[PDB]
C-alpha cells in the first residue's frame, strides 16, 4: 500500500 | 524480593495545541488504505514531533494515535482526511490521543 | 485566556497487591447477570478500598474496572467467577485495571 | 437483577 506521511 | 510498582500501560489524553505561524510541529502517518504505522493498525499516528514546537509543548509524543480533532472523529479516516481535519482546525487544536507505554 | 492543560482521560494500569493475612482490602461489585456497577457495564468493579490496606498501597482506587488477575481475563465473568479468581490468586495479586478521570 | 458485592 502507499506509505503516507504529512508535516503539519 | 522486588515487587513490580504500579505501571501505566496505556492512556487516552486530551491535548490542546496552540498553532503558530509555522504550523503544529508534527508529522502524521498512516490511514485507511495506507501502510500501517504500527502493527496492522490503519489509524492516524504522530510520526514526528518538532522539538519545542507547539505540539511538543502541548505534550504530544511520537507514536501517539490520533482519535479525534476538535470534535471530528478520525476512525476510518484515510490519510488525506486526517490531514484536512488538522489543516483546517484553527488556532487551538484539541486532540484526543491514545498512547501506550514504550 | 486560559488553555486547557494536558488531561488524562482514561488509563489501563498493572497493579500488584501483596496479600496480607487480612485479605486484599477491597470489595468488588458487578458481573455478568448482576446489576451494573456503572452505566450498563456488567464488568467487575472495585466498589471499596480499605484505607492503607494492601490494595490501597498498591494504588487500587474505587471505581477501577478489573480486567485480568494473574493472567486470568475477567471479560464475561459472573460475579462469583471474579471472586474465585481473586480468592485463589495467592500472595502476589497482579491486576490489570481500567480507570477513568473522575 | 441481583446486586452483588464481595469483600476480599
Author numbering:
A (entry chain A), D (entry chain A): 50 to 57
B (entry chain B), C (entry chain B): 715 to 816
The authors write:
Scribble (Scrib) is a multidomain polarity protein and member of the leucine-rich repeat and PDZ domain (LAP) protein family. The tumor-suppressive activity of Scrib correlates with its membrane localization.
The PDZ1:TMIGD1 structure was refined to a resolution of 1.9 Å with a final Rfree of 0.222. The TMIGD1 peptide engaged with the PDZ1 domain via the well-conserved canonical ligand binding groove located between the β2 strand and the α2 helix. Binding of TMIGD1 to Scrib PDZ1 does not alter the overall domain configuration of Scrib PDZ1 as a superimposition of ligand-free Scrib PDZ1 with the Scrib PDZ1:TMIGD1 yielded a root-mean-square deviation of 0.44 Å, with differences between the two structures primarily due to changes in local side chain conformations. Furthermore, a network of hydrogen bonds is observed between PDZ1 and TMIGD1 including interactions mediated by PDZ domain side chains (H793PDZ1:T260TMIGD1, S748PDZ1:S258TMIGD1, T749PDZ1:D255TMIGD1) and interactions mediated by the PDZ domain main chain (I742PDZ1:A261TMIGD1, I742PDZ1:T260TMIGD1, G744PDZ1:S258TMIGD1, T749PDZ1:P256TMIGD1). Lastly, a salt bridge is found between R762PDZ1 and E259TMIGD1.
